[PDB]
């Protein structure tokens, strides 16, 4: 009735009055433009000079309503482009929002957490500035209760989201000492039964395990892999997605880190992941399988044992093309590091036909990966005195018509590997 749909000039007139109630009503008016318009005029607000007036309102402890309205307006400006977030930061907002974390009003401390999450969420430099101003200690103090379930749901969701933005981004990664302060609380949110807190917790763990193997070790050492694998089997796709990403990041690390996810039973979920209706899940699960078949021979054997090779044959036969490209990598790694027996098993599962169908792809990376696999399969045929059998299989399915052509190919790596498979086998 009163503060609905003012113009910016009226907002300025109100904020500039020497009347705290008039400042209050024009702030609430600004907040409603910024929360109720799709396409809010963030830029006009900034150009009017209002950010530093809102930042000074954060400090009016005497008037908790204008604290809230300005905290809400600043949250929404900081949710915009990086130039918009920067205007909020340049206005002095970080330390003001950090003091508001101590507020006795929950709705105000919650809004301060939400604003700091938008600021941290902009990128590495603002993430690291928030840490430097000391946000971590009072953020974690807000979770220092015996049972998390006594906290309001939206409140705990906002905190988890902000903590996860403090773990996010990678040129550079968050300081080690920040990560070590945050990890124990993150392990605890990972056992909290609310799907949105579990989702954002797994995203946090996924950001922290992307990077060098030393970062992975610090997560894996906290003992979280079995809880991650349990979230991997959830029915909520927004949980399964970052749980899979975090697991996938872990198998890019050392053979010992890889074995922790095998030991926790991750491979039993892969039948469902590899046939998942959501193509992004299939893509990532196949990426993750490709890093497992880059493992040791005894890790290759566990993929075999769990019945997964037929699934990789299936995904190479019929998947979205980027999923097939990952299955191609999984095959090359398996054939480059597997025993001869493992490799015979692969051929017995029907690998040859779909491997050959992919040689008609117009993408040069995959063609090299596949020729690489052919040559590894042949080497194990060499070791067996069965190169005869193998060439017939390839000729019999259309392999030879395809490999011939790649002699006449506009890429050095391609025509060399193929004109050589011909010169050595076809013959």
């Amino acid at each position: 009735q009163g503060t609905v749909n003012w113009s910016v000039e009226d907002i300025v007139k109100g904020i500039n009055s020497n009347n705290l109630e008039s400042q209050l009503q024009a702030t609430q008016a600004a907040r409603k433009l910024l929360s109720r318009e799709k396409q809010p005029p963030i830029d006009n607000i900034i150009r009017a000079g209002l950010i530093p007036k809102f930042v000074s309102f954060l400090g009016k402890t005497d008037c908790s309503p204008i604290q809230f309205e300005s905290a809400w307006a600043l949250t929404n400006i900081a949710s915009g482009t990086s130039e918009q977030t920067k205007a909020v930061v340049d206005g002095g907002a970080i330390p003001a929002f950090i003091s508001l974390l101590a507020s006795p009003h929950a709705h105000i401390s919650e809004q301060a957490v939400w604003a700091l999450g938008n600021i941290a969420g902009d990128g590495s430099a603002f993430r690291d500035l928030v840490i430097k101003h000391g946000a971590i200690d009072p953020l974690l103090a807000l979770l220092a209760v015996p049972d998390l379930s006594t906290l309001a749901c939206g409140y705990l969701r906002n905190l988890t989201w902000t903590l996860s933005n403090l773990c996010r981004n990678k040129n550079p990664a968050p300081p080690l000492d920040a990560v070590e302060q945050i990890l124990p609380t993150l392990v605890r949110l990972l056992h909290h039964n609310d799907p949105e807190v579990l989702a954002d917790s797994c995203w946090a763990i996924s950001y922290l395990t992307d990077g060098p193997n030393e970062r992975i070790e610090m997560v894996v050492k906290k003992g979280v892999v079995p809880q991650l694998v349990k979230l991997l089997g959830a029915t909520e796709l927004p949980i399964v997605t970052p749980a899979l990403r975090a697991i996938g990041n872990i198998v890019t690390g050392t053979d010992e880190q890889t074995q922790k996810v095998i030991d926790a039973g991750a491979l039993a979920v892969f039948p469902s992941l590899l046939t998942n209706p959501k193509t992004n899940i299939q893509k990532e699960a196949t990426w993750t399988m490709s890093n497992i078949t880059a493992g040791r021979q005894d890790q290759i054997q566990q993929v075999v044992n769990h019945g997964l090779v037929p699934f990789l044959v299936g995904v190479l036969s019929k998947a979205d093309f980027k999923t097939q490209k990952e299955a191609a990598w999984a095959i090359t790694n398996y054939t480059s590091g597997g025993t001869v027996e493992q490799i015979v098993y692969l051929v017995h599962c029907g690998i040859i036909e779909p491997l050959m169908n992919l040689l008609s792809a117009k993408d040069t990376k995959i063609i090299q990966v596949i020729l690489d696999a052919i040559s590894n399969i042949f080497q194990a045929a060499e070791k067996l005195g069965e190169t005869e059998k193998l060439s017939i299989m390839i000729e019999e399915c259309g392999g030879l018509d395809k490999i011939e052509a790649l002699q006449r190919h506009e890429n050095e790596s391609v025509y060399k590997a193929s004109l050589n498979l011909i010169e050595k086998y076809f013959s």
Partner: peptide, 6 residues
């Protein structure tokens, strides 16, 4: 042999 995420 291992490949990190894009």
């Amino acid at each position: 042999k291992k490949r990190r995420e894009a």
